[PDB]
């Protein structure tokens, strides 16, 4: 059961050092070398380094040499990396893998590092009013636009979870503002738009937002 995990995540403004962590669950935190790998959102894995939990021998990728520094711990069996002065182009998931042989056998859940100088703020829910004009073909679409919020995430349920069919809760996109924008759409019977009531449930937790906008047909 020799697993070596890492922390859940964290957010920090630009130009700010950070210190992640690893583990040792059984063999010997001297035995192998730990590897650090930077996987940026929608990109191939990238190599950072290796430290030997004894001599402390360190091998850094030549691109991260002067940025991150592989610290270690033979007392507490843990490995640490430290990125000094990180930019918005440093924000990606980081892993540490126990290199069995020259290859990374066991890994450890990724620590997400978001780098942003935005301040926590609550979203704004706007009605994506009923599309049943020529779109009256049996089903009509409607949704909720959850604008400008930081950070993530912001769950979106329709009717407290009663309606879980046809609902799309698209991926939130960062804007030029540093504030995110999400959007949830549920396609539903042109008829029912009256025969039934639709309500979206946005809930951004950090700002402590929990709005319950109700979307209904537009008055032309």
């Amino acid at each position: 059961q020799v697993q070596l995990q890492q922390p859940g995540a964290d957010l920090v403004m630009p130009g700010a050092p950070v210190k992640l962590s690893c583990l040792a669950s059984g063999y010997i935190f001297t035995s192998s070398w730990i590897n650090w790998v930077k996987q940026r959102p929608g990109r191939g894995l990238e190599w950072i380094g290796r430290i030997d939990p004894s001599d402390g021998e360190v091998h850094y990728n030549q691109d991260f040499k002067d940025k991150a520094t592989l610290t270690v711990d033979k007392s507490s069996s843990t490995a640490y990396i430290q990125l000094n002065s990180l930019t918005s182009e440093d924000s990606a998931v980081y892993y540490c893998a126990r290199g069995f042989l020259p290859w990374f056998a066991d890994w450890g859940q990724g620590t997400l590092v978001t780098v942003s100088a935005a301040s926590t703020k609550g979203p704004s829910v706007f009605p994506l009013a009923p599309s049943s004009k020529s779109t009256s073909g049996g089903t009509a679409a409607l949704g909720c636009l959850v604008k400008d919020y930081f950070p993530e995430p912001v769950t979106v349920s329709w009717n407290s979870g009663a309606l879980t069919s046809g609902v799309h809760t698209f991926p939130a996109v960062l804007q030029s503002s540093g504030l995110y924008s999400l959007s949830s759409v549920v396609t539903v019977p042109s008829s029912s738009l009256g025969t039934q009531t639709y309500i979206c449930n946005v809930n951004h937790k950090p700002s402590n937002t929990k709005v319950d906008k109700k979307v209904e047909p537009k008055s032309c």
């Binding site: 894995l45 990724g110 706007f126 698209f170």
Partner: protein, 214 residues
């Protein structure tokens, strides 16, 4: 330094069919390329180490082969599990390097998308903005296109779409191209169109809307 390259970037397979992913080292890496399987939520997993070695706990269903500059991971028969992301690695020269990777997605029959246009709401307007959201519903394949048109003028750099992954049930995508402009720049025009071009559509469809009427 030692550039690893995968191909394709993303391939569509049918459940239960032998598939072959590619990898080519920049320089000879002598049987050092290993393979990792990674599902969205998960961190990578070593399935193949050495050039061809089914790492402890890998199903026989997965086999490897290669020598100097060319490698391939062959899933002998896809399944619900197998559909994920694969990366080609290396560890024979510092620094070690990975290939961009290649996603595995299920195949099905073309599906023309369903487009809906939504005029911004008044509350959004009063505060200074105007986000007009175009909706392309349940299409296939992923390869789509939304063309915004204000008063016949082609916009540019002022809209931002977002696509979902394959629906767990019907295995179809979805996309939302949002167009935002100040409540003033908005009120300067009357017609807002959304021209969607897909390979399921005979010609491109266009949802339009006029401020005031309907």
């Amino acid at each position: 330094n030692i550039v690893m390259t995968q191909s394709p970037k993303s391939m569509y397979v049918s459940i239960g069919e032998r598939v072959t992913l590619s990898c080519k080292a920049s320089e000879n890496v002598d049987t050092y390329v290993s393979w990792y399987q990674q599902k969205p939520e998960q961190s990578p997993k070593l399935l193949i180490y050495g050039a061809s070695n089914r790492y402890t706990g890998v199903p026989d269903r997965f086999t490897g082969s290669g020598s100097a500059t060319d490698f391939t991971l062959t899933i002998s028969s896809v399944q619900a599990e197998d559909l994920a992301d694969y990366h080609c690695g290396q560890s024979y020269n510092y620094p070690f390097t990975f290939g961009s990777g290649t996603k595995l997605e299920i195949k099905r029959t073309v599906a023309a998308p369903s487009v809906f246009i939504f005029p911004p709401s008044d509350e959004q307007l009063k505060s200074g903005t105007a986000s007009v959201v175009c909706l392309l519903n349940n299409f296939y394949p992923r390869e789509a296109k939304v063309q915004w048109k204000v008063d016949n003028a082609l916009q540019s750099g002022n809209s931002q779409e977002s696509v979902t992954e394959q629906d767990s049930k019907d295995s179809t995508y979805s996309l939302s191209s949002t167009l935002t402009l100040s409540k003033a720049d908005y009120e300067k025009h009357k017609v807002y169109a959304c021209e969607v071009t897909h390979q399921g559509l005979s010609s491109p469809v266009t949802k339009s809307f006029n401020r005031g009427e309907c």
